[PDB]
Amino acid sequence: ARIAAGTIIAGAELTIGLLQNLLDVLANVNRKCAVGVDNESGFRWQEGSTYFFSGTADENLPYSVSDGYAVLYGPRKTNGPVATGVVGVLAYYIPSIGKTLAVMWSVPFDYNFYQNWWNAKLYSGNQDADYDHYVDLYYDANPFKANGWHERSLGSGLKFCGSMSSSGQATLEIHVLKESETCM
């Protein structure tokens, strides 16, 4: 079908129900996240990269996300009784503002101690997604719980809003827009 992870769609198509469909076509493992990031920024995103602290994805992250488009991505845990979740970062270079957008997800194995988290941030230059982004976004830069919609300014005239669902098979919906536009 036209639902497929590791692809680009018109940004206006992105909703939670679309991401739930995506979840259903990902591998049938018990920790996974259907990620959708809508580029309403007015700027081209390119050189997509990924970093996994744990887990993997079966489809590669698209190279670019033009203005007006959303990217779909499907991180999931390693298969089996391995007591692991899926935790990582995707990043895009935004050349017209000289910044890198990074997006973090964390879907833990052990909900007896942990919970879902997500975050997004701009960094300067063209930074390949890496562990230092994960640590900043998860431990230092005030990530969001799976408790509804949230909005935060990014600088460079941009902001983001988004929402993550709370269980081990999760959706993560994020929209990146100009500061003057309304998401909340």
Q: What are the boundaries of each domain within the chain?
A: 8-34+42-168
Residues 6+ apart with CB under 8 A from 108: 31, 85, 87, 114, 115, 116
Resolution number, Å: 1.5
Integer CA distances (angstroms), 53 to 31, 82, 89, 109, 173, in order: 14, 15, 8, 13, 21
Dihedral angle of Cα 113, 161, 10, 93, to the nearest 10 degrees: -80
Q: Is 8-34+42-168 a domain of CATH 3.60.40.10? A: no
How many whole angstroms separate alpha carbon 132 and alpha carbon 181?
A: 31
